[PDB]
Nucleic acid binder design. Sequence first.
DNA 1: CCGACAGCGCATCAGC
DNA 2: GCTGATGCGCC
Length: 326
Amino acid sequence: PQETLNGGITDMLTELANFEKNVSQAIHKYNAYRKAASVIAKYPHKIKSGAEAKKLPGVGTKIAEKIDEFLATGKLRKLEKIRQDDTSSSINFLTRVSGIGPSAARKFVDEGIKTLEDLRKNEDKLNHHQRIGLKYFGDFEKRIPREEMLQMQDIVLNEVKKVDSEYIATVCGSFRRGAESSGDMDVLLTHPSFTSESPKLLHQVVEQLQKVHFITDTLSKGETKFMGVCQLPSKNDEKEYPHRRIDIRLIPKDQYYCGVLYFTGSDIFNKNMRAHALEKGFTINEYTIRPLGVTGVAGEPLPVDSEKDIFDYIQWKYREPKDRSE
DNA sequence: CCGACAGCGCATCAGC
DNA sequence: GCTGATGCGCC
Ligand SMILES: *O[C@H]1CCO[C@@H]1COP(=O)(O)OP(=O)(O)OC[C@H]1O[C@@H](n2cnc3c(N)ncnc32)[C@H](O)[C@@H]1O
Ligand code: NA
Ligand code: NA
């Protein structure tokens, strides 16, 4: 399917999703609307009625009702009303700033702070994350083409290896799945001297990337997880590159390949792989693969030395990251 | 009828 | 000072 099919419907549910998350603070309704929007997006027919829709998993009576009103009128009275509501539309908007969630956004709107402009002139009321969110607002909503992503990886792999050539680093996410575009860059990191039963391995890497001016800002940083901002170097006499979000995780060697598997995704793959792994009598999380004893008692973590090792535990042939779409 | 719906690292806040 | 809750972004 393409947008033309049911796009009007999926954008409707998407709008509703966002209002529930950001304004109503109903994360479960947010996820329900998204489930609905997603499954309709894959459905290869121009839907004709709510009842047709209701046959799909995740679409219930309420969405089938909404689809009917939209089909017959071309709009939803609720969305129309919401869209015109200064308070709600402003609360929703502010959440686009990284670090401003629905609670901060409601607080800001409670006190008259409604726009980026109001944020700009109210710097003191923003934490560190939010200020970086604000500063990079437009940059953070841009996608990252694969070629820039390839250039970003070049930099990360070169500099990590310079710090210690025994580091293992893997750019995961959709990029590793061969996506043509990316939302950010997620880098998983491990070192032989770091296992489950075992200095500042992560700080040393972050610092090197800051030394060559690849990492430009820090959103959060501890011993195992770094979240921040990076930027490719502008070619001599040429427009700067956008600033990009990058996350760096330090994982123990023995849970590294579980981490790669998990953070490569995508979600559908993990959910199905975990599902099938349950049928086959193991449990897989982000960190481990544990077998289930006769009743339901998960034993200790199994030895994993590669992504394939975990496939080779649950009788699956190693699927490539290219086809871990579902 | 009613609860699950993922849960974790980190920054910052509420409260002692 | 400290500890725990809360908010946030994230497959
Ligand atoms: O989220 C709903 C689905 C599961 O439980 C709730 C409530 O269901 P209902 O009591 O059957 O319906 P309702 O509370 O009226 O609808 C909830 C949302 O939809 C809007 N809405 C208000 N009134 C209606 C009616 N009569 N029909 C459809 N939708 C309606 C509300 O603004 C709510 O957000
Ligand atoms: Na359904
Ligand atoms: Na945000």
